[PDB]
Design a protein around this nucleic acid. Structure first.
Ligand SMILES: Nc1ncnc2c1ncn2[C@@H]1O[C@H](COP(=O)(O)OP(=O)(O)OP(=O)(O)O)[C@@H](O)[C@H]1O
Ligand SMILES: Nc1ncnc2c1ncn2[C@@H]1O[C@H](COP(=O)(O)OP(=O)(O)OP(=O)(O)O)[C@@H](O)[C@H]1O
Ligand SMILES: [Mg+2]
Ligand SMILES: [Mg+2]
Ligand SMILES: [Zn+2]
Lengths: 42, 636, 650
DNA sequence: TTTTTTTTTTTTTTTTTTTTTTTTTTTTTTTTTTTTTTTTTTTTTTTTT
């Protein structure tokens, strides 16, 4: 028994003011993947 | 040395296409059906019989037996990875643990993004999500070992040992995976637990709290965490495998899961498990090095000889009119004579039926005191009945007196507090307590036995203890009546020398006297010389039954509650009033009371149980009365 | 650091000397055969007599005994080389082969009191009584770890730094890969050696009668762990050493010492015999020559200092041989031990017979009337008080399992004790239980007991029932009951007195010439070897322990060897013997078996029939017969007929 | 092709900063272990009519 140490495990966030760095990083990611150039004809 | 991916493929193949003909010569894929039941949450424990594995891969069995934790893990992984394809329908979410599991799976698929590479610490631990337990039934090719001889060369190996259970703790929640939640993030942290103690986590390691560099303090929770049923048992060597001048050696067995609640103290068990170390951290140790405690990690607990958990001809001999005589004659067939004594002992084994009318319990147990002259097989019969009965305890004289009969409060080891341990009368609860040398028993024990034989409880109001113990045990006592020998110059109740209360508690006080008698002494001596000559009793008309068979028959007779008709009430009443009139009229008779009538009733219900009828008949009453009369025959 | 040594001169020379000593072929072949025998017995410790080294190499012997650690390392390397030379695969099986020492350690033979600090790092031979044993724990010597992430397997070695300096790097258990992948330990692939600690105390009979006992701690490692249990009297040979303390910036100069055992042997050098081919041949010829009166010859040779008591000596010979246990298939049991009770007048030598059996039989335990009370005679249950768990403690009768309890002054015991003896006497076991533990201890012991009658002197004008004070149930346990009277007849007086004066005249041959018997004052015993733990003409030379040369007497050493061989025999009741025994028992149960003015000393029960069978079996064993023939049965019947009846005078 | 001024340009150092390396260093609590009491639960010698 008291010989091995497994690590610690965590999951993703299961959901749940001034925006936190996680939300800002999400907004940066959505800007990078959603920023759009050109016009309707172009 | 070996590739565990190959070994997991090996165990997957074994699980998927091993078959036998267990149900009436029908190939049924023994482990596939169990995998189906496991996938539907209809079965928790899977026992892998290593005999089956050896049938088609003996070196896999040798690998399993030489590093058993590794292969328990490999088999658990193979089962985990096989379960999804054996699922035929949807689990009905039996309990709350299932709700947690399927919420976790739902949320993991919802935010999956499967092509992404996650961190190795960002999934669920395997043991958090199982709901099944995998155990090995060791190969029959491995001989059972002696607890003394399970040593450091067998650490990590699958061993079988046999012993008596002396001490087993209560089932308690041992945490397997600690689950925490955060005050900042909404993720769950998981701490699989291998040590005997753990330090609870403080900060959460979640990705969202590492990005935010917040506090993220995490809170240990029982709700999402995972526990397992856990028992700790001590198990002792059998008397016949202890070396000559020694005492038996104990081993600690850590029982957990579906293997809990099998072994009770006093049971003869055979335990298959892995012999493992527990590191001995903390103790400022005299010797340098990594010293550890050992224990057996249980995999398969099987209750043995008397603790053990029919063909048409079998029911034929049960329905035979001489079944009662054959069973009684199978009682210790190496003791010559004592035919009616063996009938009475058989009735004690079967017992009467308990009555609970309008909140006034009257026991069904039958108590018998053999009070005989020296050397008349009383201790041998007591010892035989102890060997035969399923929950029996044997006590002699004053070697197990006081708290060896009642309970005592003892320091718990698992947590450390004061737990109540039962003595002989508790270990023999709902069984037989064989009390040898009854006449030389300490008076405090005798008073305790008063209460046991009538109320079937033990009340204790000493300092550390204030309890009432259940002691629903038949009492088979043996004594010498007065000064070693029965002398006819003195009455009964003078060479019986039992108070009327204690005397009346016994349903049968059997008197044995060995008066010399030439032809009878020859018959006994021939029997005994044959036994010394062949290590068995001489051949007779009917071969005596095995103790396994005797146990099975007695057990079948046990759940056979027969009733007393209204029609017998006059016959039984007349028998009682008659017995009572000889007691009054005679000048050499013992104390007769209403307990004599209850003795008639419960003896006759035990006879009826032996015929496996549901109604007591006149012949049962007749035989009961004959037994009560024979019990005092030797004084004639 | 990280230095290696390039052919150390002293280690090389030592290993050469030790391998020369082990390679015994130009010499008598002793240790070469011993190494073969450990190979064949599948063991990895060789016990070396240090006298043999002194004979072959004084310089090695002294250097080994005074510098034990490195010398023993050299001698175990030499042993591994030699074992490989005989058998390389066997040498491959075991990582290290060990060397235990035995023989005569002159000044190194100490007691726990005398084991001072001048013996540190020397080999010593300590004798004492085991007071406490630890549990047998496994100590990891090689751990194997699997990394599931990388599929890598790691092994770590832990060297035995018990008495060496241990830096913390030497004791870390690997839990993580180099890049912090968790490792899982492979328990089945790791190697453990089991480890025990016992404490040896100065034996109470040898300690100075005034003061408190002195102890020494002993480390037992693999093969040596379960060799001793609490209450055992043992020799431990090993190295006396200081243990390291923990790391600290301050130290008192005070060191905790232990003895690291290289060998443990029991005091019972009487519980293990040594039979050479010549001994076996002598035994076989002695049994074949006179296979009829061999029993009488063995009996009359039993306690030579005691004159008379021919039947009592025959009975004691039967007790020392025993019967055969019947272990029935359904687990039932009939005992095969004989219990004898000697009642009699004062000064008829019954304590002398008990003392003879005590100094003659193996596993013989002495006990007196009130010196063993309650739990000191059968087992006891105590609580560990460290773990809080109940423990068993073996009393006199458990320790005499497969032996004899010689209970002297049996009549002066309490009735509580005498009724505790009942189960041991008949069923051969002790059943004890407290709440947390219940055991059934084997006490397969025979009871030889000596008692005085009530009134101290046996009244010949009363029945034996009222001279013996024992109840019938207890008397029934003793299968033979001898009334040993002091009949004051002048002729028997002349016989006894002539014998006694001859034994008071005898002087040991040459060893003595007019001198006194030393007291053995606790420094003289350590001067020589202990006869208890020490390492055959079938007859004795005649001088005047006997009056004339007319009938020879068996040698005591040969009698021990012969009885040890004959005890293993399992003679079978033949049908003629069984019929005769049954007929005699039925006759003996009857009143005609006793005339007028004769009385039963003990009741005749079925135990008497088993008594006849056990006595006949022991008689058959004496002849090494393998069957119980009619002569054995009639000898048993005459023993019983003699013992069970007594003429009462007016 | 003899004389003659800028030109470096190799050599002495010196500055001189910036960076990496070097050097220094007991006390104080805690805890197990042993050896003691101490209330309570027996249990083993005391006597009567
Ligand atoms: N039919 C029988 N009657 C009497 N004794 C028998 C019989 N068969 C066998 N025996 C023998 O009796 C011996 C045992 O004595 P037992 O166990 O009877 O003592 P017990 O009845 O307890 O007497 P006690 O009152 O002296 O304790 C056993 O060795 C057993 O073989
Ligand atoms: N044949 C014999 N008969 C009687 N005594 C003998 C005989 N031979 C020797 N003795 C001596 O008698 C002495 C006393 O014997 P012992 O002390 O053994 O008697 P005991 O029977 O134990 O007496 P008690 O019953 O008072 O204990 C011993 O010194 C012993 O040597
Ligand atoms: Mg008995
Ligand atoms: Mg004496
Ligand atoms: Zn968080």
């Amino acid at each position: 028994s008291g010989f091995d140490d497994p690590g610690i495990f965590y999951s993703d966030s299961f959901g749940g003011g001034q925006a936190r760095k996680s939300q800002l990083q999400r907004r940066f990611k959505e800007f990078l993947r959603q920023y759009r150039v050109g016009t309707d004809r172009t | 040395l070996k590739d565990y991916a190959l070994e997991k493929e090996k165990v997957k193949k074994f699980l998927q296409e091993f078959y036998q003909d267990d149900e009436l010569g029908k190939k049924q894929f023994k482990y596939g059906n169990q995998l189906v039941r496991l996938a539907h949450r209809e079965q928790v424990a899977l026992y892998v019989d290593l005999d089956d594995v050896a049938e088609d891969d003996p070196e896999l069995v040798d690998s399993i037996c030489e590093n058993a934790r590794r292969y328990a893990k490999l088999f658990a992984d193979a089962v985990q990875e096989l379960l999804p394809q054996y699922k035929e329908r949807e689990v009905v979410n039996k309990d709350v643990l299932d709700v947690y599991i399927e919420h976790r799976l739902m949320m993991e698929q919802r935010s999956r993004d499967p092509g992404m590479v996650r961190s190795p610490q960002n999934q669920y631990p395997a043991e958090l999500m199982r709901r099944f337990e995998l155990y090995f039934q060791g190969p029959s090719s491995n001989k059972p070992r002696v607890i003394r001889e399970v040593r450091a060369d067998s650490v990590g190996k699958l061993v079988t040992v046999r012993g008596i259970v002396t001490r087993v703790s209560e089932v308690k929640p041992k945490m397997v995976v600690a689950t925490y939640t955060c005050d900042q993030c909404g993720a769950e942290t998981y701490q699989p637990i291998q040590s005997p103690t753990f330090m609870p986590l403080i900060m959460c390691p979640s990705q969202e709290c590492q990005t935010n560099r917040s506090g993220g303090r995490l809170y240990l929770q029982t709700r999402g965490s995972r526990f397992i049923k856990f028992q700790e048992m001590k198990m002792q060597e059998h008397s016949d495998q202890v070396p000559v001048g020694n005492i038996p050696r104990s081993i600690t067995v850590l029982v957990e899961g579906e293997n809990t609640r099998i072994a009770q103290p006093g049971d003869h068990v055979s335990v298959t498990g892995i012999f493992l170390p527990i590191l001995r951290t903390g103790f400022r140790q005299v010797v340098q090095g990594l010293l550890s405690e050992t224990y057996l990690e249980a995999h398969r607990i099987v209750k043995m000889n008397k603790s053990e958990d029919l063909t048409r001809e079998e029911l034929r001999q049960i329905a035979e009119e001489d079944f009662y005589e054959k069973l009684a004659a199978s009682i210790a067939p190496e003791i010559y004579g004592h035919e009616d004594v063996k009938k009475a002992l058989l009735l004690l084994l079967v017992g009467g039926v308990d009555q609970s009318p309008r909140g006034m319990k009257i026991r069904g147990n039958i108590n018998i005191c053999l009070m005989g002259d020296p050397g008349v097989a009383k201790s041998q019969l007591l010892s035989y009945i102890d060997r035969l009965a399923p929950r029996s305890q044997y006590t002699t004289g004053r070697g197990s007196s006081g708290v060896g009969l009642t309970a005592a409060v003892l320091r718990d080891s698992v947590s450390g507090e004061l737990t109540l341990e039962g003595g002989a009368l508790v270990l023999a609860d709902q069984g037989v307590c064989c009390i040898d040398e009854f006449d030389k028993m300490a008076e405090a024990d005798r008073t305790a036995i008063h209460e046991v034989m009538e109320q079937q409880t033990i009340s204790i109001a000493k300092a550390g203890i204030l309890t009432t113990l259940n002691a629903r045990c038949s009492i088979l006592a043996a004594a010498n009546p007065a000064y070693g020998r029965y002398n006819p110059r003195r009455s009964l109740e003078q060479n019986i020398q039992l108070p009327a209360a204690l005397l009346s508690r016994f349903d049968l006080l059997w008197l044995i006297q060995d008066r010399p008698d030439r032809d009878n002494d020859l018959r006994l001596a021939q029997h005994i010389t044959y036994v010394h000559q062949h290590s068995r009793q001489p051949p007779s008309q009917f071969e005596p039954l095995d103790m396994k068979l005797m146990r099975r028959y007695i057990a079948m007779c046990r759940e056979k509650q027969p009733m007393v008709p209204e029609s017998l009430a006059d016959y039984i009443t007349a028998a009682y009033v008659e017995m009572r009139r000889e007691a009054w009229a005679s000048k050499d008779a013992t104390y007769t009371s209403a307990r004599t009538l209850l003795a008639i009733l419960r003896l006759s219900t035990a006879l009826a149980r032996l015929r496996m009828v549901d109604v007591v008949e006149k012949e049962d009453v007749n035989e009961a009365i004959r037994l009560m009369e024979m019990s005092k025959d030797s004084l004639l | 650091a990280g230095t290696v040594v390039l052919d150390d001169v002293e280690l090389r020379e030592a290993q050469r000397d030790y391998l020369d000593f082990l390679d015994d072929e130009e010499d008598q072949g002793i240790y070469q055969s011993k190494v073969r025998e450990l190979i064949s017995d599948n063991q990895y410790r060789l016990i070396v007599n240090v006298n043999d080294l002194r004979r072959k190499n004084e310089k090695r012997a002294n250097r080994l005994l005074n510098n034990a650690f490195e010398e023993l390392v050299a001698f175990q390397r030499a042993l591994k080389d030699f074992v490989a030379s005989i058998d390389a695969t066997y040498a491959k099986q075991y990582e290290e082969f060990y060397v235990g020492l035995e023989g005569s350690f002159g000044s190194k033979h100490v007691s726990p009191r005398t084991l001072t600090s001048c013996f540190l790092s020397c080999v010593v031979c300590v004798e004492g009584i085991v007071t406490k044993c630890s549990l047998v724990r496994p100590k990891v010597v090689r751990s194997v770890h699997y990394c599931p992430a990388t599929k890598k397997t790691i092994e770590r070695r832990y060297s035995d730094l018990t008495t060496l300096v241990a830096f913390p790097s030497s004791s870390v258990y690997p839990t993580k890969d180099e890049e912090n992948n968790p490792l899982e330990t492979e328990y089945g692939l790791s190697v453990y050696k089991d480890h025990q600690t016992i404490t040896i105390q100065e034996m109470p009979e040898k300690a100075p009668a005034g003061q408190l006992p002195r102890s020494v701690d002993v480390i037992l490692d693999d093969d040596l762990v379960d060799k001793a249990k609490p209450g055992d009297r043992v020799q431990v040979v090993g190295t006396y050493r200081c243990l390291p303390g923990k790391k600290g910036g301050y130290t008192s100069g005070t060191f905790r010492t232990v003895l690291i055992a290289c060998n443990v042997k029991q005091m019972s050098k009487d519980a293990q015999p040594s039979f050479s081919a010549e001994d076996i041949a002598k035994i076989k010829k002695f049994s074949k020559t006179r296979s009829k009166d061999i029993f009488d010859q063995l009996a009359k040779s039993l306690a030579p200092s005691i004159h008379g008591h021919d039947y009592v000596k025959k009975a004691i010979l039967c007790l020392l041989l025993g019967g055969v246990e019947r272990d029935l298939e359904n687990g039932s049991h009939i005992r095969g031990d004989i219990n004898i009770l000697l009642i009699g007048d004062p000064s008829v030598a019954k304590s002398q017979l008990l003392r003879y059996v005590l100094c003659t039989a193996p596993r013989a335990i002495p006990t007196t009337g009130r010196g063993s009370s309650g739990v000191g005679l059968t087992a006891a249950v105590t609580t560990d008080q460290e773990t809080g768990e109940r423990r068993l403690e073996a009393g006199a009768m458990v320790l005499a399992d497969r032996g004899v309890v010689c209970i002297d002054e049996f009549d002066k015991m309490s009735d509580m004790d005498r009724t505790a003896i009942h189960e041991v006497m008949e069923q051969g076991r002790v059943t004890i239980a407290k709440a947390g533990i219940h055991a059934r201890l084997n006490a397969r012991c025979s009871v030889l007991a000596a008692a005085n009658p009530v009134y101290g002197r046996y009244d010949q004008y009363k029945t034996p029932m009222e001279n013996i004070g024992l109840q019938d149930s207890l008397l029934s346990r003793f299968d033979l009951l001898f009334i040993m009277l002091d009949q004051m007849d002048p002729e028997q007086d002349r016989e006894i007195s002539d014998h006694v004066l001859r034994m008071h005249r005898y002087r040991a041959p040459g060893e003595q010439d007019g001198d006194a018997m030393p007291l053995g004052s606790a420094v003289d015993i350590l001067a020589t070897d202990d006869p208890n733990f020490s390492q055959y003409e079938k007859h004795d030379n005649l001088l005047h322990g006997t009056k004339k040369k007319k009938e020879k007497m068996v040698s005591a050493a040969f009698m021990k060897k012969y009885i040890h061989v004959a005890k293993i025999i399992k003679p079978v009741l033949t049908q003629e013997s069984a019929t005769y025994i049954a007929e005699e028992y039925s006759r003996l149960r009857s009143q005609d078996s006793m005339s007028s003015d004769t009385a039963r000393t003990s009741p005749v029960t079925a135990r008497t029939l088993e008594t006849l069978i056990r006595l006949a079996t022991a008689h058959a064993k004496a002849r090494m017969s393998k069957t119980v023939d009619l002569q054995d049965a009639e000898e048993a019947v005459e023993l019983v007929q003699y013992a069970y009846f007594k003429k009462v005078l007016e």
